[PDB]
């Protein structure tokens, strides 16, 4: 339900903190990640630059 | 924000910046918009199924 196409540029360790019911230290404040949140991840190596 | 960017391999582990596309789902009352194809199956005919 409520599928959205979202993108972020955040540290690697905080990408995994978007799991439902997890209060991300940095990700949650920028974008709320409550128990009602769900989705997936598609990460790319941006460290080149 | 003074040094929130510019990952340094010498110090700090796990905070490497990554460009990530994150799908977002919510439990709002609005209707759903995603339903996987399931990969479907062959269309059998003239037999109980």
């Amino acid at each position, epitope marked *: 339900t409520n599928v959205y196409a979202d993108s972020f540029v955040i540290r690697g360790d905080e990408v995994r903190q978007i799991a439902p019911g*997890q209060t991300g230290k940095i990700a949650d404040y920028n974008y709320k990640l409550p128990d009602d949140f769900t989705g997936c991840v598609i990460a790319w190596n941006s460290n080149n630059l | 924000p003074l040094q929130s960017y510019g990952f340094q391999p010498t110090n700090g582990v796990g905070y490497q910046p990554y460009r990530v596309v994150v799908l977002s789902f919510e439990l709002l009352h609005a209707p759903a918009t995603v339903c996987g194809p399931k990969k479907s199956t062959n269309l059998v005919k003239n037999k109980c199924v």
Partner: nanobody
Amino acid sequence: QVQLVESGGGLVQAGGSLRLSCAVSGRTISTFGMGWFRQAPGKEREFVATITRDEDMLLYADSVKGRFTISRDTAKNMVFLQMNSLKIEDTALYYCAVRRDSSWGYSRQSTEYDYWGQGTQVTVSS
């Protein structure tokens, strides 16, 4: 400091096969999701592979894509990682999947797991 204990260790014959299973029970991988990752010499972290509940497709790491295999059992309630065609470059500490913060899910990123405690030391040479 304490170090994680994993099946194997010591000198490993090149091109052989070995099993990687976690021994500690205080923080099992199941709580944080079954998976495996290894730390190359220095301060480099990388991911090897993991098994998904579907059992039809296994998340393979590009570094070892198509090399490692994972066995599955209905009632064993455990995951065993099997290595195939080992090389000298495989020498690296092996760690059990653990996250510094609460989370649950499946992923294929190098920085998925990390912990201060060192892992089992595995040396591979010809």
